[PDB]
Each structure stands twice: as structure tokens, then as C-alpha cells.
């Protein structure tokens with residue numbers, strides 16, 4: 001099959017948050033059937049980033065999800081042709097991130113071409129002031145609507161010292177060919193970072209994702 005037990009990852013993100021432009025490139029690897037992946041990210045333009053890196057990390061591929069045999073796998077079926085996704089993250093203080101990604105496959109490597117725009121973040125809020133400390137673990141509700149797969153998360157962005165900000169995710173995942181469509185289900189995520197310098201010039205992200213009925 002085209003999705004091997006061990007796959008590699010290359011990515012590029014072009015982004016703009018509150019007007020600040022940047023480029024990030026990443027290289028990594030994962031185990032698509034185990035639902036695990038890791039990516040090493042480097043800021044290539046725009047360093048040091050003047051905002052929270054956590055609003056970028058979930059943009060850095062549901063092909064890396066453990067799926068039970070009885071739930072059709074929208075993402076793995078889409079290959080070799082691939083899929084793309086479009087996501088809106090709405091923050092409780094009216095900040096908003098819109099991000100899109102195109103996921104393709106070259107040999108044994110997934111390639112992500114990502115574009116991200118963040119706007120309307122309060123200038124002295126925790127995002128622009130770099131006061132976040134990662135994401136909680138989460139549950140994404142997956143469901144078919146208008147012939148494509150949608151995912152919703154009621155997420156929590158953790159704040160240094162205490163508490164969190166609520167962030168709603170709405171994602172549309174679009175296979176590039178017809179695939180067998182799943183019934184509604186859940187994907188449980190845990191995204192984490194290795195300890196990093198506050199400049200965030202180099203960051204390693206890890207994610208685990210498991211689907212369940």
C-alpha cells in the first residue's frame with residue numbers, strides 16, 4: 001500500500017499574525033497506523049516570532065491517526081492523491097486564526113503546504129504577549145456534512161501560571177477523490193512540545209491521535 005508503517009514529513013508554513021509575517025519549515029516522521037508523529041520546526045523568516053507559538057502547532061495531518069478497522073479512514077483512503085483541510089480557530093477574546101493546508105505524498109514523505117492568517121488578537125492579550133503554555137488534550141468530533149468530513153473541537157489553550165483560554169476549532173477535510181465515508185466518531189488528540197527557548201526559533205512538536213466510535 002501507499003501508506004507505509006513509517007512515513008516521513010516535510011512542511012512549509014507561510015503565516016501572518018496581527019500583520020507579522022513569517023515562514024516556518026519542518027521535517028519529521030511518524031507511524032500512521034499508531035497515530036503518532038513528531039516534527040522539528042525552524043523559523044526561517046520573521047524570527048524571533050512576536051506572538052504565541054501555540055497558535056501554530058496544531059497546523060503542523062490526520063493520516064497520522066489510529067483507526068479501528070470498522071471506521072472508514074477518510075484520510076488514509078485519500079492517498080496517493082491526498083487531501084486538503086481548512087480550519088477556523090475562534091478564541092474567546094475574538095482573536096481568530098484561519099489556516100489551510102494541502103497534504104500530498106512524495107515517495108515515503110507527506111508534504112504539507114500551509115498558509116495561516118491570525119488576526120484581531122488584543123495587543124496585550126496572552127497570544128500577542130506570549131503567555132501560553134500549550135494545549136490541553138482534546139477530543140475532535142468527526143462527521144460528514146456536504147459530502148466532506150468536518151471536525152469540531154471545544155479546545156483549551158493553557159496559560160502560564162494559571163487557567164486557559166477557550167478556543168473553538170472548526171475544520172473541513174476534503175479528499176481529492178471519492179472515498180468511503182465514515183459515520184460520526186471521535187478523535188482523541190494529545191499535542192505536546194519538547195522544552196524550548198522562549199524565542200521559539202527551533203521547536204519539536206509531538207502528537208498522538210486515536211479514533212473511536
Ligand SMILES: [Cu+2]
Nearest residue numbers: 001002003004
Ligand atoms: Cu506498500
Ligand SMILES: [Cu+2]
Nearest residue numbers: 053054196200
Ligand atoms: Cu512555547
